[PDB]
């Protein structure tokens, strides 16, 4: 998911925002 | 904005600062 | 172990300190 | 919520607890 | 995204999210 | 400056990007 | 509580949390 | 000691706890 | 250098910056 | 202690490596 | 004062620590 | 430069000061 996919690869402010509430 | 390589606490700072007063879910794997 | 203010990003980092891989919530609105 | 409990007011880390998944 | 007041060494840690590898100025005399 | 902009007011992610080089 | 990964200066937030008025003491080995 | 092994392996807020004045 | 407010969280990362191996105290009681 | 003078006042880098062991 | 392995967002940390009212200049290689 | 120096090998608050302004 999001928490390992920026970690291991990277990952955009705007995936990021979809776990916003 | 930039691409992001974020782990452990830095993820949470970076959702934090991406999610301001809607706040957010930090849901790991298993 | 002690009661303290945690605000902010503060707030987010003690959560993800006790919460750790079972995630959590941070809900401000409430 | 939260932010009152933890912030405006002083919480612990077993309080903290109350918002894990 | 959302408007916050950020300030410190929280507001380089934002300059620093957001810039990555551009680069940044953190000036506060202006 | 980036401090009136960001601390003493409120200023977005966009804002912030003024200051990257 | 779960169990914690901490390196560097994340070591130093959690004794920060954990210990709160109390304070603590960060002794690494040599 | 206790900064070596919450890093090279893992360790308890339990076991922080033992570092507090 | 400088001379700044360092309060917290802020006060115990930079005393692991200024001290690192050395190790430190942090002691607000006194 | 360290938090009136680092924090209620200024304090140097050079004064925080007074709390150094 | 001692020497430091500083990655990430931890530089800027200490650049900001470092610097204090006079600010900084982050920029890193490509 | 200082940001992969600091993080591949090490550096001191003596060279980060020369990225003051
Ligand atoms: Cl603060
Ligand atoms: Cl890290
Ligand atoms: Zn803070
Ligand atoms: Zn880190």
């Known amino acids: 998911g999001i ?4 970690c291991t690869s990277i990952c955009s402010l705007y995936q990021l925002e979809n776990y916003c509430n | ?10 993820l949470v700072e970076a ?5 301001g007063e809607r706040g957010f879910f930090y849901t790991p794997k298993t």
Chains 1, 4, 6, 8, 10, 12 share one sequence.
């Open chain 1, 3 to 6: 928490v390992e996919q920026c």
């Open chain 2, 15 to 19: 959702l934090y600062l991406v999610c």
């Open chain 2, 1 to 10: 904005f930039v691409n992001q390589h974020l782990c452990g606490s830095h």
